[model samples]
Target chain A: KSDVQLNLRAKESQRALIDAAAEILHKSRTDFILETACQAAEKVILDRRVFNF
Target chain B: SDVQLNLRAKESQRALIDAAAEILHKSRTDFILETACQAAEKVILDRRVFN
Candidate 1:
């Protein structure tokens, strides 16, 4: 079975740094942003928020 | 770098998952789960305990 994920959005006054990085990488901005997001979720988000002091 | 890791665990718990996983060449969700567990433990261990 396939799953679809929904992402909620907020209006931003400006673009995010990931968008800039993706532009510099010569990859489609979406591909670059998604790859980096996956890496961040896999490494950082998986750790949870136990030591955020 | 090391090539392998040695683990110590209760025979029943270890064998139940390890042997079965080894026979299938599949690591239980154990490896990543334990990895996520160790990471959680370390985060608590050296934590600053204050705002």
Candidate 2:
């Protein structure tokens, strides 16, 4: 199978900021965002608030 | 390589996010992803590890 599509949309300002930060530590946009997201989900998720079904 | 990971959220939640997005000048999708990811890292890294 080929690589998947993880589409994320945000303002150019933040994108630029992320890119700048990533460049310093040497990280691609995809890698930076993916690592950030995964660290979030795996690290700690809570409150199964059933608002709508 | 990119992929789509869809998520279902409450209408109220969406609205809340919309509000947040408006403040930040960002789209709903962008706010959610950025916030969700950072929050995750924060919680995981903060639970015990400082910084």
Candidate 3:
């Protein structure tokens, strides 16, 4: 079984995340935040909520 | 294999990768750590696609 995952955002580190996200994707901060966030929802939560046991 | 993967990081940020492993995907700590790492590298590359 794959390990569970989590996403955390500290206000300070968030600044780097914003800049990194924006520069890496060339996406606006808003879009980057949304997409990057999707990683958790897609990779972990969704896998658990909808999957064959 | 002559290919080598070398990189650098600060102590605190490296600690973050460790934390991510604990809080999220607990498989191989380095797995998610490395994957996210590679993606970060791709972001800096302007090639659009790379082999």
Cα misplacement distance, residue B2 of candidate 1 (Å):
50
Candidate 2, residues A1-53: lDDT per residue as tens digits?
Answer: 33344346455555655556556447666555555544433322222233223
TM-score of each: 0.32, 0.45, 0.37
- Misplaced by over 4 Å in model 2 are A46-53, B1-32, B36-51
- Per-residue lDDT tens digits for candidate 1, residues A12-44, read 311233334444456553344334333333444
Positional deviation of residue B14's Cα in model 1 after best superposition, in angstroms: 32
Candidate topping TM-score? 2
lDDT by residue (A1-53, candidate 3, tens digit) is 23323333234443453457467667664444334433533555445556636
Give the clashing pairs for model 2. A4-B2, A4-B3, A5-B2, A5-B3, A5-B4, A6-B2, A6-B3, A40-B40
For residue A9, what is the lDDT in candidate 1?
31
Which prediction has the highest DockQ against the true structure?
2
**Best of the candidates, lDDT:** 2
Per-residue lDDT of model 1, residues B1-51, tens digit only: 212222233344433444434444555433323333343344434443532
Better of 2 and 3 by TM-score: 2
Candidate 3 interface RMSD to the true structure? 12.7
Please give the ranking of all candidate structures by lDDT, highest first, separated by commas.
2, 3, 1
i-RMSD of model 2 (Å, 1 decimal): 10.1
Docking class of 1: incorrect
Give lDDT tens digits, candidate 2, residues B1-51: 333443343444444545555655776566656754454444445544543
Docking class of 2: incorrect
